[PDB]
Swiss-Prot record, chain A:
InterPro entries: Ribosomal_eS8 (IPR001047), Ribosomal_eS8_CS (IPR018283), Ribosomal_protein_eS8_euk (IPR042563), Ribosomal_Se8/biogenesis_NSA2 (IPR022309). It is a lipid-anchor. It comes from Oryctolagus cuniculus (Rabbit). The keyword Lipoprotein applies. This is Small ribosomal subunit protein eS8. The keyword rRNA-binding does not apply. The lineage of its organism: Eukaryota, Metazoa, Chordata, Craniata, Vertebrata.
UniProtKB/Swiss-Prot annotation, chain B:
HAMAP family: Ribosomal_eS4 (MF_00485). This is Small ribosomal subunit protein eS4. The gene is RPS4X. It comes from Oryctolagus cuniculus. The modification N6-acetyllysine is found at K233. One of its GO terms (molecular function) is structural constituent of ribosome. Disulfide bonds: none annotated. Pfam families: 40S_S4_C, KOW, Ribosomal_S4e, RS4NT.
Curated annotation (Swiss-Prot), chain D:
The modification Phosphoserine is found at S67, S110. PANTHER family: 40S RIBOSOMAL PROTEIN S11 FAMILY MEMBER, SMALL RIBOSOMAL SUBUNIT PROTEIN US17. SUPFAM superfamilies: Nucleic acid-binding proteins (SSF50249). The modification Citrulline is found at R22. Component of the small ribosomal subunit. Part of the small subunit (SSU) processome, composed of more than 70 proteins and the RNA chaperone small nucleolar RNA (snoRNA) U3. It is found in: Cytoplasm; Nucleus, Nucleolus. The modification Omega-N-methylarginine is found at R69. It comes from Oryctolagus cuniculus (Rabbit). Signal peptide: none annotated. One of its GO terms (biological process) is translation. Belongs to the universal ribosomal protein uS17 family. This is Small ribosomal subunit protein uS17.
Amino acid sequence: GISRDNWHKRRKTGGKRKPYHKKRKYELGRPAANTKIGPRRIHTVGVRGGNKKYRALRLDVGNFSWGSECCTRKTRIIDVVYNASNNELVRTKTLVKNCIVLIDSTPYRQWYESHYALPLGRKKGAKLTPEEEEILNKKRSKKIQKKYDERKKNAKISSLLEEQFQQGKLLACIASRPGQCGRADGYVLEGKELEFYLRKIKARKG
Amino acid sequence: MARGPKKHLKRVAAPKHWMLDKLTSVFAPRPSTGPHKLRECLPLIIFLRNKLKYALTGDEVKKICMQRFIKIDGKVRADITYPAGFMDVISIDKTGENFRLIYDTKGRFAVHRITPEEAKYKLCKVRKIFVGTKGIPHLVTHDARTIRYPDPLIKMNDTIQIDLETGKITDFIKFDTGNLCMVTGGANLGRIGVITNRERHPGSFDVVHVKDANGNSFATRLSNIFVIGKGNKPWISLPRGKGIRLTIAEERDKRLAAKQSSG
Amino acid sequence: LVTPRVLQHKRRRIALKKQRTKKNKEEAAEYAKLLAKRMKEAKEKRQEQIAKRRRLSSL
Amino acid sequence: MADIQTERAYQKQPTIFQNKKRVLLGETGKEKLPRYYKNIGLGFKTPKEAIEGTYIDKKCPFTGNVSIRGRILSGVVTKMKMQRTIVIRRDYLHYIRKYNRFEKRHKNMSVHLSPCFRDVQIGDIVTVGECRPLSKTVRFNVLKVTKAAGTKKQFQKF
RNA sequence: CCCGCCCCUUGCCUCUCGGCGCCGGCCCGAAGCGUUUACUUUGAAAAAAUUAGAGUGUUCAAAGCAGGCCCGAGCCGCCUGGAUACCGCAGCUAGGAAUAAUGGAAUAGGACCGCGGUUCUAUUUUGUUGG
RNA sequence: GAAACUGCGAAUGGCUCAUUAAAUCAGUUAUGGUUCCUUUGGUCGCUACUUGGAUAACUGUGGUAAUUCUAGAGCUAAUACAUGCCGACGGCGCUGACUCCCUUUGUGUGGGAUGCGUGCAUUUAUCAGAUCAAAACCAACCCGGUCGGCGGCUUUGGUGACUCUAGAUAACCUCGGGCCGAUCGCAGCCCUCCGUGGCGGCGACGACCCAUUCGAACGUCUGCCCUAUCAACUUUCGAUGGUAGUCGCCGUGCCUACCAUGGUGACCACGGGUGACGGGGAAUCAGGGUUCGAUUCCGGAGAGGGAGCCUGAGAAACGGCUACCACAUCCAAGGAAGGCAGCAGGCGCGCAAAUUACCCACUC
Ligand SMILES: [Mg+2]
Ligand SMILES: [Mg+2]
Ligand SMILES: [Mg+2]
Ligand SMILES: [Mg+2]
Ligand SMILES: [Mg+2]
Ligand SMILES: [Mg+2]
Ligand SMILES: [Mg+2]
Ligand SMILES: [Mg+2]
Ligand SMILES: [Mg+2]
Ligand SMILES: [Mg+2]
Ligand SMILES: [Mg+2]
Ligand SMILES: [Mg+2]
Ligand SMILES: [Mg+2]
Ligand SMILES: [Mg+2]
Ligand SMILES: [Mg+2]
Ligand SMILES: [Mg+2]
Ligand SMILES: [Mg+2]
Ligand SMILES: [Mg+2]
Ligand SMILES: [Mg+2]
Ligand SMILES: [Mg+2]
Ligand SMILES: [Mg+2]
Ligand SMILES: [Mg+2]
Ligand SMILES: [Mg+2]
Ligand SMILES: [Mg+2]
Ligand SMILES: [Mg+2]
Ligand SMILES: [Mg+2]
Ligand SMILES: [Mg+2]
Ligand SMILES: [Mg+2]
Ligand SMILES: [Mg+2]
Ligand SMILES: [Mg+2]
Ligand SMILES: [Mg+2]
Ligand SMILES: [Mg+2]
Ligand SMILES: [Mg+2]
Ligand SMILES: [Mg+2]
Ligand SMILES: [Mg+2]
Ligand SMILES: [Mg+2]
Ligand SMILES: [Mg+2]
Ligand SMILES: [Mg+2]
Ligand SMILES: [Mg+2]
Ligand SMILES: [Mg+2]
Ligand SMILES: [Mg+2]
Ligand SMILES: [Mg+2]
């Protein structure tokens, strides 16, 4: 079937080479996965030596990380925004390594408000009266100075990141190959990477 | 043609220090996978039926081994193509005799009966020192043995004497200039001497010099040195000749002048 | 069908794990002893070094 | 080198992190970007233009992810027309035995030149090391550039 | 034709940690290596079989790797071989410096703790943590 | 102890030389860029006195011209198929109701229920990866001791070189799609005690991971017969390089997207021929050479010609399967079955090459 052999190529001089043998099995095919977004399905391929290998199709949940905070959570993947290799991989919402994805951003908000005792980007406060000010402004006399005042000074999320938390989504990069592992892990963009990718996105579409 | 691993060995392609004929048949024992390499081992059938003449065919050595008589390094081996190798101990207690496979002088194994008190330990060369999970130091010797928790001052190329019954490294000799050694590969396969030098070529094949007990010098690669003593004093018992390699002229003079024909 | 030999096999299978745990315990103990023994000689090397260092830094 | 972002993806060294820190640890003089580099060994010295300067080359020997092992050859530069890739020529003599005489022969090698070296021009002598296949016809990397011969880089006043 | 003296004759060094003198002090071997190569000599590493070659009365030889002794058998045996050479060219290694290549400062800079100025900085000790 | 289920082997060996001209192959090196059934050595604890249903053989009824075709009916097992606990945790860190002296408080002090996670293997991210040459002030602290300050410590392993090995943190789990034994054989002991509460050795088998062995694959340098009546070749039908990915056991235009315009040649590239498989080797030979190597050892390739796959550690397998082409066999014309360049034997081709023998006694 499909083959990865070197012997169908021209040699460096531009000359043809003639084959000496039929196609082997250590030179195999196995067409692409083309992971979409949706309810999970994962098939399993038997490869050289045994060693099953998981090929994902329609993943919808990932394990992403925030490196400044060292805080990693399970999250939902919403959409793909950028793709350095092709552009038809954003029209079809296929999810490959080094893609740029939107995630749900909620568990990071939960951990942040719980760890710092301080809010994210919030517009108005009425929902904070029955609940959430319960977490953020917890009724305790011990700790609530000594601990959380050492949590403060450090709780200075940058302009772009705190602007992200308002619309309820983030920008993340996949750092794992879902076609080989069946997992869509990665890390949320920050700093100059975030600026570069935001400018690229703004420049491409529209 | 060759889609997998092979399992036959032709008599003409077998190692030469087995000292086989060329008229018995097209095939050779083909030692089974073990702790010693294929070209550097000596199967059980060849040691029993060819060097010891205890057996006369392959059936006889099979039915000698199938009676739990032969012990290699303490344990009872039932296979007749087991790859016994350097510094091993054979034990046949039905007759009360123990041997030790060591190259004599001419690049082949000898028959080297030893005392039963000496057939308890064996010397092993260290090839690898790595750390496992939870920071436990391991060893790897020249015969695939793995030792956990060695004292953290034994390194590569050093020799360790181990108890055959329990493992449990007992003592060790250090690779240094001045230590007795036997060469276990190449052209000087069998000669014994002191180190006196170690040339170093970063990236490939650091060579080592040797000078035996008669002022003759010869070099080898570091991959073939085997420290067997502190210096001028072996830890295992040496065979007859003691790796001296007297030349063909001296060979002829000693064979003629002694008139070694019979008793 | 349950038979005394099945229970004997199970007893063997549990005693093996017990023996393995005892082996690990005592081996780790002895190696920690030996490592602590080596650290004293390392201290001795370092103190000899510092002593001769100050010796030759005198003049 | 003011802007090394020329391709459609963010070029950056792996194993390097843009961390959480305070205001004005530097607004110019400390831009919070360290440099990964390794020593090749075998006596070859890492050039300072790889430690100081900034560029993204995963295939460089000194800062990228590649290991030099095996053979070490040398040659003279013949062509510099590809991106980070040059063509060097090795001449030698082949001894025919019927006659007792030699004959001149040559081989060409495509080799990888890191942006660490910026002084190379046709005619220099170049040392190379052996790496894993880096492309269809590239297996070597330039370790060292030298030019200490006649008709030197310029008039000899050094 | 290996040690060293007219200038040098492995040889300049720069220090440093490991073992070596001697009456805290005194000193040479250890680190770079002699611009490089070709050449030449030497080591290492290269399956066997075949080829050359050592031993051995297959009844001789072609072959083969064998075989030789002493006891009436009362030894429940002993001795001994299965060598060695060659294996170009290319790659590795260390001596030699004739021959043949290649190179050095002409609009200079080699050298000495020579200094002068500006400028970056390693992060050790001042006991430690920090301005 | 027949048969049948199960496990393993059938990828070795044997045969032939059609293809193949930097291809194979040879010497040399590299996997710090990969996989590896088995062997040997390490690893094995974070209804349980033992769970479920359901197929063979066997019994019985059949169908078709025909095959190592196979349907319906009735039973019964597992080291087949599928589930799944028990123990011994007396396990630390993060939480922080509350709580204790004097500085309220912050902080200089000491307990703490409560909850969460807590083995190795997978995936992503992050942290540390320790010892340089000396002193002077100021805010706070250990010790030589004192109620404002002087002398004095800084701690896995290895390589020429790793983004190595090991360690710490936050999560993730792939189940039907990791591990942590519901398996079989020999021979035995104490019971605050009357068969069980208990425990005791020796094996077989199985199994995640690491190392070893046997390899396999992909790479480095050098080496090739004749031909110019072959002088320019290669390139969206990848040609040479760059960045991101897909796929693959892994490195890599291996393949895709976007860029650059490169790469080889008179030192013979590119094209053509070979009654060309390569080598160790054979004949001849004063010295140099010339010719041969289908052929018993090593390597490669193929099973009429191409192509595509299943099982498996390992095959693009032909003593395996599925199609097309070329041949050719039986038919009850509906259908079924095939691959001797294995050993004998036969036809054809030719100037040209042996018995349709006996045996596993030797070598394996
Ligand atoms: Mg072919
Ligand atoms: Mg496996
Ligand atoms: Mg075969
Ligand atoms: Mg075998
Ligand atoms: Mg001969
Ligand atoms: Mg003869
Ligand atoms: Mg040579
Ligand atoms: Mg030389
Ligand atoms: Mg039976
Ligand atoms: Mg088996
Ligand atoms: Mg099989
Ligand atoms: Mg034939
Ligand atoms: Mg051709
Ligand atoms: Mg080549
Ligand atoms: Mg080869
Ligand atoms: Mg080769
Ligand atoms: Mg095992
Ligand atoms: Mg039924
Ligand atoms: Mg590319
Ligand atoms: Mg890539
Ligand atoms: Mg062009
Ligand atoms: Mg051609
Ligand atoms: Mg052709
Ligand atoms: Mg042909
Ligand atoms: Mg030929
Ligand atoms: Mg001649
Ligand atoms: Mg041939
Ligand atoms: Mg032919
Ligand atoms: Mg024939
Ligand atoms: Mg080969
Ligand atoms: Mg085939
Ligand atoms: Mg045919
Ligand atoms: Mg199998
Ligand atoms: Mg086939
Ligand atoms: Mg076959
Ligand atoms: Mg069939
Ligand atoms: Mg057939
Ligand atoms: Mg036939
Ligand atoms: Mg005729
Ligand atoms: Mg004839
Ligand atoms: Mg005829
Ligand atoms: Mg037989």
